[PDB]
Design an enzyme around this catalytic site. Sequence first.
Site, short mmCIF file in Angstrom:
data_model
loop_
_atom_site.label_atom_id
_atom_site.label_comp_id
_atom_site.label_asym_id
_atom_site.label_seq_id
_atom_site.Cartn_x
_atom_site.Cartn_y
_atom_site.Cartn_z
N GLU A 183 42.99 44.42 31.88
CA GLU A 183 43.26 43.48 32.91
C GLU A 183 44.72 43.06 32.84
O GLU A 183 45.37 42.95 33.87
CB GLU A 183 42.38 42.28 32.74
CG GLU A 183 40.93 42.57 33.12
CD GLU A 183 40.69 42.83 34.63
OE1 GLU A 183 41.67 42.82 35.41
OE2 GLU A 183 39.52 43.20 34.96
N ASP A 216 43.31 40.34 49.88
CA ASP A 216 42.63 39.19 50.55
C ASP A 216 43.39 37.87 50.46
O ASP A 216 42.95 36.87 51.00
CB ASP A 216 41.15 39.01 50.08
CG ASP A 216 40.99 38.57 48.61
OD1 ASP A 216 42.00 38.30 47.95
OD2 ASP A 216 39.85 38.50 48.08
N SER A 220 44.03 36.26 47.64
CA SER A 220 43.78 35.60 46.38
C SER A 220 44.73 36.22 45.33
O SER A 220 45.42 37.24 45.57
CB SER A 220 42.33 35.71 45.93
OG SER A 220 42.04 37.09 45.69
N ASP A 253 27.37 34.20 35.54
CA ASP A 253 27.21 33.98 36.99
C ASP A 253 26.13 34.87 37.56
O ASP A 253 25.63 34.58 38.65
CB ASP A 253 28.55 34.26 37.71
CG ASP A 253 28.58 33.84 39.17
OD1 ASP A 253 28.28 32.65 39.44
OD2 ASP A 253 28.97 34.69 40.01
#
Length: 129
Positions: free
Chosen positions: A35, A48, A50, A101
């Site tokens: 990452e 998008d 973000s 989640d």
Amino acid sequence: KVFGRCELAAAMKRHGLDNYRGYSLGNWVCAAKFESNFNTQATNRNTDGSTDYGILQINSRWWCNDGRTPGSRNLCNIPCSALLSSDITASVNCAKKIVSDGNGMNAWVAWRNRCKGTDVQAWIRGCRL
């Protein structure tokens, strides 16, 4: 801060990420590698609008507030800038919410494409833990 591999493994362990939701430390270290290349200050903008922040590239659409993501939520209740700290506490705390989640570590696309199913233990091999 750019962590060393073992240094981050130790920090993740200290902060309770070892086997969190059943994901061994190597999983977390591997996800951080791909990452952010272990760089707390990593950011990356998405199509998008973000942005992904920090060692675990946590996204502003759901998890943190950056003030520039229309329609977004802040479910970790933190400024996205907190995710860029040398101290990984905020990233860890938010990651625990994310991995809880529903989809586990599949939330991290780099984990699902580059870590999942691999010999993730390699990422902590050699480390004093």
